[PDB]
Design a protein around this ligand. Sequence first.
Ligand SMILES: *[C@@H]1O[C@H](CO)[C@@H](O[C@@H]2O[C@H](CO)[C@@H](O)[C@H](O)[C@H]2NC(C)=O)[C@H](O)[C@H]1NC(C)=O
Ligand SMILES: *[C@@H]1O[C@H](CO)[C@@H](O)[C@H](O)[C@H]1NC(C)=O
Ligand SMILES: *[C@@H]1O[C@H](CO)[C@@H](O)[C@H](O)[C@H]1NC(C)=O
Ligand SMILES: *[C@@H]1O[C@H](CO)[C@@H](O)[C@H](O)[C@H]1NC(C)=O
Ligand SMILES: *[C@@H]1O[C@H](CO)[C@@H](O)[C@H](O)[C@H]1NC(C)=O
Ligand SMILES: *[C@@H]1O[C@H](CO)[C@@H](O)[C@H](O)[C@H]1NC(C)=O
Lengths: 50, 100, 114, 246
Amino acid sequence: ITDPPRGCVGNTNIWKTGPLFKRVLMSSKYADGVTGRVEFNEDGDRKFAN
Amino acid sequence: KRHGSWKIQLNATSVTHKPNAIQMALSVCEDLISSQVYAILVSHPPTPNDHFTPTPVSYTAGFYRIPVLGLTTRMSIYSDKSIHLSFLRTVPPYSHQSSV
Amino acid sequence: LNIAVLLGHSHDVTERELRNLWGPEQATGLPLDVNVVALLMNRTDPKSLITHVCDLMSGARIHGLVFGDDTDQEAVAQMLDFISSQTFIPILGIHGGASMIMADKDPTSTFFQF
Amino acid sequence: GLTGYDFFWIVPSLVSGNTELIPKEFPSGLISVSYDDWDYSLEARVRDGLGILTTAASSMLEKFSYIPEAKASCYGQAEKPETPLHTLHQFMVNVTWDGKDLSFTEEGYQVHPRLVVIVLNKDREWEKVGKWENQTLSLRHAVWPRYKSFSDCEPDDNHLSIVTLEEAPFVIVEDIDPLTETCVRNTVPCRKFVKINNSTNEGMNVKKCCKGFCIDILKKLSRTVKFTYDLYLVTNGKHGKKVNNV
Ligand SMILES: *[C@@H]1O[C@H](CO)[C@@H](O[C@@H]2O[C@H](CO)[C@@H](O)[C@H](O)[C@H]2NC(C)=O)[C@H](O)[C@H]1NC(C)=O
Ligand SMILES: *[C@@H]1O[C@H](CO)[C@@H](O)[C@H](O)[C@H]1NC(C)=O
Ligand SMILES: *[C@@H]1O[C@H](CO)[C@@H](O)[C@H](O)[C@H]1NC(C)=O
Ligand SMILES: *[C@@H]1O[C@H](CO)[C@@H](O)[C@H](O)[C@H]1NC(C)=O
Ligand SMILES: *[C@@H]1O[C@H](CO)[C@@H](O)[C@H](O)[C@H]1NC(C)=O
Ligand SMILES: *[C@@H]1O[C@H](CO)[C@@H](O)[C@H](O)[C@H]1NC(C)=O
């Protein structure tokens, strides 16, 4: 696992695991929450609103 | 506190909303260099009391593919991954109301 | 009028050759001003991009921008479109990430792409 | 086994991506549509951008005189109200410069973009095959050359070179339809080499539409025997004759 770099020091590159971290976030699921059950759909928006 | 015996720490940093979108992007980028953050949150519609667009944060953190998690914006401009590369939100957009 | 042409290390052409395009660029000078300011851009950091664009805007009040890039980073295109809304500067994407097409642009942005 | 000699894959510029980077498992003959034109140099692009900007400036000059609309500074939006009074957005949507039309669309696209049709040859390289001229397409190869996709096995054997000749009830040749540029449901494409003139040896492969009794027989033969063909008309002479043992 790499790490997010600087924003203004010779870094035009991207976070190698940035897409991986986004996929991990999009694959996350819950059963309890202050807002309720949270799960992200294919486009990355909240699924099963009230 | 409630995430097991693993000895990793979670640190939180924050920056203030500014009326200038250009200054918003500059502050976010400075913040980047200032914290090696892993994700950025944007949740202030009424504090600037305006279009409240989190677009500078989304663009800046999508340059490095750093995921952004908005919590209040419900516009459909953020539901296409071609424009906003690393945007997620806990509030469904207005276009979901059609389902209802 | 005052127009800026901003390239990276694409073909390693110096700003002088970009300034050479004054004769063929509207030889019949209608505004009699058509001055071209050419800058060299080393890296595509969004902070550096914003700083360059708006500093050259504060310098001699450029009325346009012809931006070319040598990296395959599409986000740069977005970072121009947003700027086009905050500065009302017509921006033209030439090569690299800037020339990558963009699906939807905000109406208050005058960004155009080749 | 879906990438043989007969199979054709067409992908947009997103799949092809950077021309220099050519990954493995990309079959030869992969047809792509790209804009990264090597004939379109950086200097030409800068020239075109400066030209369109100056033409928009002139179009503004024709209508108004308050053309230098420049924002005050880089910061302080809360202290400065918006002044989007006159802009160059509405003028360079319709524009012609240097004898060529460079008009844009309302979404930021070019109305006449310089597209290129590229192919992946047997050398694992991207070659220029076609060009987007005006609003039509100009192809370098009138008939499609076939490329060694796998480059490891399975040579082509079910593709046949078939010659024929114009005879009234058996092979009827008609000109290609100007409206569609495709053969009608009853005919099949058939090429014919037509010389430019008498003295010159140069000619072009006119695509006509061939039908008739023999053409229907050929269609049934291709359906049953399961082969493919590039039908074409002969030009040396009639059906057959031996002159000087040739
Ligand atoms: C944890 O987050 C806090 C957020 O305030 C960090 O405090 C800031 O850190 C940056 C860079 O480290 C400094 O430039 C700021 O001056 C700090 N703010 C204040 C009020 O002191 C803190 O450093 C972080 N801890 C780390 C990264 O170990
Ligand atoms: C561009 O200029 C900066 C100035 O600090 C320098 O750090 C960087 O190495 C330069 N990039 C080059 C020469 O490619
Ligand atoms: C487009 O521009 C040409 C330039 O000569 C002009 O003649 C024509 O009327 C324009 N069409 C419009 C503005 O619809
Ligand atoms: C092809 O482009 C040229 C460029 O000026 C134009 O004059 C011509 O009318 C175009 N052809 C057609 C059929 O429109
Ligand atoms: C043009 O081509 C015709 C054949 O199609 C030929 O008879 C004629 O001589 C040619 N004209 C010349 C060579 O000037
Ligand atoms: C070509 O030239 C020959 C020799 O004069 C002439 O007989 C013949 O008619 C020409 N072929 C045509 C008509 O293309």
